[PDB]
Design a protein around this ligand. Structure first.
Ligand SMILES: Nc1ncnc2c1ncn2[C@@H]1O[C@H](COP(=O)(O)OP(=O)(O)O)[C@@H](O)[C@H]1O
Ligand SMILES: Nc1ncnc2c1ncn2[C@@H]1O[C@H](COP(=O)(O)OP(=O)(O)O)[C@@H](O)[C@H]1O
Ligand SMILES: [Mg+2]
Ligand SMILES: [Mg+2]
Lengths: 654, 652
DNA sequence: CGAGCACTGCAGTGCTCGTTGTT
DNA sequence: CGAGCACTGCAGTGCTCGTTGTT
């Protein structure tokens, strides 16, 4: 309450932002200048000084990590006493709005979210069903196309081709794709955002209701917003809502998904009386780390520059280690962390960052061999594991037979006599009759259109699903899950998967029961099954979340934006890894990789360590990458090359 | 003794039996005692001419006819037959090749290749020669090859298509001789060549067998004739008996000209004709005569009898095959109920497939019966498989046995794997087991395959030695179990799986019994091939006799029933499609009718199912050829329909 | 009616080629 | 380098098509 406790630590610019009149404001500043601090305290100020209701506040951002950071700080300052307040990601809040107004959004209340793997599989099926050649029209490319369209709020009709074969056909795939999804009750990530926006365009009363409620909007890491997210925010505010956005154009790293830097300027041009407050003092890092970050970003052109200075001492130098290979690299990092831990440092204060999720495997193996606890975020996590996807598909079918993605994944898993031929018929019937896979089956059976054994095998499957639905129709989430895993036969085929592969695999199925068991959700209303499935999709990059045990934090450079750690290790500092080969294979996606390097460097509070491997094996071949150009861009006085302690063993003559 | 031998004979039979040693032909109609003469002649040669039993060879074509000679010889001379050779051409030829395999150029335990096996191999062979199966039917090759051997012709021979078959024939021989396989025709030809190439061997037999007697001479084809002619040379004395009106093997080389050939070639050859019939009633005999008279080129013959007319020939029109079968069982039941023996009843048919519905009706009526010919016990799938494992144990080169059980039970050796081994043998000029031995040794087969194939070769070797020191049946039972066949047939769909498991049991019991120039197992195997038609050894039990009209030639029964007397069955469609097929079929009907001693019964169905489809045949023309006073149709209604006077109407 | 064929499901296998991040 | 398949091989199953007689 006491305004006094809200402003004490804040400096000149921070106070100006926090204690400002209600109005559209942009807080623009480099990393670690306290923008998120300003955002959280602003919320506290709006509630105590401007007496705004918690219910009129919306705090939003793109990534789960940054949203969690906002939420955590909001809890510590105002206490968990923040009911009525919406804090989450654009996808999360969109999902929320959609569940609450599914009818107006033209969606079934229990719609299922389609993740990337599911979306790619559906597309691989649709394309083949359209007779299109595989290697000719990649489903991956179709996915990029479709998602890019949705990133720009464009539906199949909004766009027309002018001959352009590739364009006109991708257009057909997109039409069929949308048809299959709506018909199956499926919603992909991009659909959540677009549908949510369309909701307020088609339902003026619904929008009015929200414009009346959310009069205070706050967006963190604004430069992450793409066009559909920007539009959504603009709409919600109208000419009555007061918005505070904080961000840094030097940390723009989502150009590949529609987030353009112009968005910051657009806010200044579009929102009523919008103004700018620039923060200039960094509190996160040592001068050594900050000086390196500054020299690095300076290498990008086209930027009105920013101050960013600190009071802190130079601190330790930035370590640079040239590893023998990727294995030595991982072992070195673990060795360094052990030392930190042996001297009283928490493992959770250590982050290991990398450009691509594929780099975590070797790090993981080194951590495991050292019996050092760790948590990995992003990439192939728990809910994306084969056995877990299989288990959830049965539950998904129980919730909705029309779930074509679920149907395809387990209709014949474990094998039950329903081979490719039979399924090809089913898919053909869905294609021609414009029906869901389960729908098509119902007919092909009530028309004796299939062979004897076929229809019989297919009939049994449908009976097994209908059975599971009734049997567990009342069971609590976790027991229904235990049941399904056993009765589906999945538990059986996995036990006898042979090797240590099947063992860990059966454990994951056990861990899933626990997850559904310990699952906690609250505040409108959604059944446990749906709420769990949507959580597994929206916060998949999270996986299982034991968060109290001290453990090393592993994640991409992207997922780390917004976070900070006393010790930071950035591995794979080599041309072809970071910058990524794709950014190299292009001429200037380099400034964005450099902005990502800037993000990486500014995560370190006390110590930053950079590593690169003379050689590593990629795709069956040994490669000798050049050292990343970002290393040389740092000031030599801030960097200290690591020279392994000289030794000597027992003399061996001959 | 002498007296007994002549007491019952008529003038002509006596003349034949008590004649000096010389080449003689006894030509006479059915049932005139030709076989009686042949048998008594043997006794005469031993008592009066004091010829040694070791100098006598009595041979004929079919197992039934040979068994008939064997039986009468035994009833006339008992045990005074030791050293005497009595059997079939294939049988005696087989005994010779065993006793002189080295000189015949055959392994000690060569395996006889029956019809099924021969055809299968020819299918595998033709495909390997990249020949189009539909362009070169394996059935054609079989007909070609055997027909070639019926004449004693080797793959040499002297046309476009002619040269191809000639080649198929060549590969076939090489394949067989390599695997150590001998087909039925190979037995006759090889036996004959054995005398053409081994003078000292021929001399030994000409010195031993100075007395040759052949029954049913008109069954001899060209290779069998040569064989006999050669054995007799210019020193051996021969008696051949037969009747050209009973020539029914034209389809396998047997020609009427052979009887005349005998009179031309054999030194001092003379003919003696018998005329009196002692088998049948006058009714049956006159129907037979009217029947045979419809064939042209006949010189007459026509035998008679002193016997009374006896019962007429019953004619029954059945409503379908099943009714035909049940009607016959009904008639036989009455015969039995009046003290008649079942074995005095024979049910004859044109083709073996007709026995099935008959067997079904007999089983349903719990009437004991015994079938000869066609798909017999040793022809059964399960029995064949079990005997194939036994064959590979006696010779891994047995390609027929190999490819039959290599993947039965299924053991991972699929068709793809086998196709490789096949082209391997085809080009490497070796057997299948030899191709597998190599390919495996010189690692050329995938890990999955190679591990299964050898796994099989290992199994056989195990079985081979594991049972080399035990009894036949013990060895059989063992091989049936360890081969997996037992387990396989036990799970086999309960649609017939049981009976098959029961047949395998019978196989053991059969091997358990069974009755010395060869090992027990090789004797059993060869018997199953040469006498396959006999099926399982018969008990003493009284039972109805079922067999084709062909197999019945030489036999006689108080009661004879001939079923399927329908156009399309007898004579069949195929008999109206070629030269003198129809007349040969009529000769077969003459043979059928003349088997009957007291009563003959002819039946035909208004409808029957052939290859599944329902047909409606007209009664056989042979029925209409019989004199109406010899036949009495079986009434299907009791009253005589009242004549229907014409009603003068203009309505449609 | 009964022996081979055509089909379909399933397991074991070399062969190809993507190849950056987040929801 | 390894997921994803395209292939290949083996089997179980439902349906098509036709052959005298003997050793
Ligand atoms: N005025 C201040 N006094 C002391 N610490 C501060 C102040 N402002 C921010 N911080 C601390 O500095 C660190 C980085 O600031 P942060 O909010 O995360 O920066 P930004 O969001 O701009 O990247 C945090 O540990 C934060 O708690
Ligand atoms: N002279 C005879 N007196 C009495 N019965 C005879 C006489 N000759 C033959 N038989 C009997 O007549 C029947 C038929 O004679 P069989 O030798 O079989 O004729 P074929 O061989 O000429 O067809 C037999 O039952 C036979 O034992
Ligand atoms: Mg921040
Ligand atoms: Mg006779």
């Amino acid at each position: 309450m006491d305004v006094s406790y809200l402003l004490d630590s804040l400096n000149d610019k921070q106070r100006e932002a926090v204690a400002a009149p209600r109005s559209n404001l942009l807080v623009l500043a480099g990393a670690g200048s306290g923008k998120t601090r300003v955002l959280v305290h602003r919320i506290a100020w709006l509630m105590s000084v401007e007496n705004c209701s918690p219910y009129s506040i919306m705090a939003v951002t793109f990534t789960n990590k940054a949203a969690a950071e906002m939420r955590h700080r909001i809890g510590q300052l105002m206490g968990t006493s923040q009911g009525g307040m919406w804090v989450g990601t654009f996808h999360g809040l969109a999902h929320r709005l959609l569940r609450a107004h599914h009818m107006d959004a033209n969606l079934p209340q229990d719609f299922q979210i389609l993740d990337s793997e599911d979306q790619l599989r559906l597309l691989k099926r649709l394309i083949k069903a359209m007779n299109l050649d595989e290697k000719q029209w990649p489903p991956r490319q179709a996915m990029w196309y479709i998602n890019s369209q949705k990133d720009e709020g464009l539906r199949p009709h909004h766009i027309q081709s002018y001959g352009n074969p590739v364009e006109q056909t991708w257009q057909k795939v997109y039409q069929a794709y949308q048809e299959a999804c709506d018909r199956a009750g499926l919603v992909d990530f991009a659909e959540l955002l677009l549908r949510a926006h369309e909701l307020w365009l088609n339902k003026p009363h619904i929008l009015q209701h929200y414009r009346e409620r959310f009069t205070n909007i706050l967006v963190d890491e604004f430069q992450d917003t793409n066009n559909i997210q920007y539009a959504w925010i603009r709409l919600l505010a109208g000419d009555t809502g007061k918005v505070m956005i904080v961000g840094d154009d030097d940390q723009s790293i989502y150009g590949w998904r529609g987030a353009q830097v112009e968005n910051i300027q657009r806010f200044l041009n579009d929102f009523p009386g919008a103004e700018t407050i620039r923060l200039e003092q960094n509190y996160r890092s040592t001068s050594n780390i900050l000086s390196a970050a500054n020299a690095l970003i300076e290498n990008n052109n086209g930027r009105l520059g920013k101050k960013l200075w600190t009071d802190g001492a130079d601190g330790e130098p930035i370590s640079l280690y040239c590893a023998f290979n990727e294995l030595d690299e991982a072992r070195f990092v673990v060795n360094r962390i052990k030392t930190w831990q042996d001297n009283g440092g928490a493992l959770a204060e250590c982050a290991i960052l990398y450009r691509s999720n594929a780099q975590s495997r070797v790090l993981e193996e080194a951590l495991l061999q050292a019996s050092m606890p760790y948590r990995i975020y992003g990439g192939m996590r728990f809910f994306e594991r084969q056995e877990i996807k299989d288990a959830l598909s049965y539950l998904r079918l129980i919730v909705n037979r029309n779930d074509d993605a679920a149907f395809e994944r387990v209709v014949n898993t474990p094998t039950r006599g329903i081979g490719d031929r039979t399924l090809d018929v089913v898919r053909q019937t869905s294609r021609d009759r414009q029906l869901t896979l389960w729908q098509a089956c119902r007919e092909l059976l009530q028309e004796k259109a299939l062979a004897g054994r076929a229809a019989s095998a297919l009939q049994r499957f449908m009976e097994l699903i209908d059975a599971l639905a009734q049997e567990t129709a009342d069971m609590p989430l976790h027991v229904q899950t235990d049941r399904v895993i056993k009765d589906s036969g999945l538990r059986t085929m996995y036990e006898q998967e042979k090797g240590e592969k099947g063992q860990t695999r059966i454990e994951n199925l056990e861990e899933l029961v626990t997850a559904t068991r310990q699952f906690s959700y609250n505040e409108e209303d959604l059944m446990p099954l749906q709420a769990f499935l949507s959580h597994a999709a929206l916060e998949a990059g999270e996986g299982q979340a034991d968060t109290w045990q001290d453990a090393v934090q592993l994640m991409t450079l992207h997922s780390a934006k917004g976070l900070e750690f006393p010790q930071v290790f950035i591995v794979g500092m080599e041309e072809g890894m970071f910058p990524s080969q794709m950014s190299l294979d292009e001429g200037g996606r380099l400034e964005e990789e450099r902005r990502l390097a800037y993000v990486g460097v500014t995560r370190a509070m006390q110590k930053l360590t950079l590593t690169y491997a003379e050689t590593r094996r990629l795709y069956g071949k040994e490669v000798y990458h050049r050292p990343s150009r970002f290393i040389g861009e740092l000031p030599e006085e801030c960097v200290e090359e690591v020279r392994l302690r000289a030794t000597v063993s027992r003399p061996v003559s001959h």
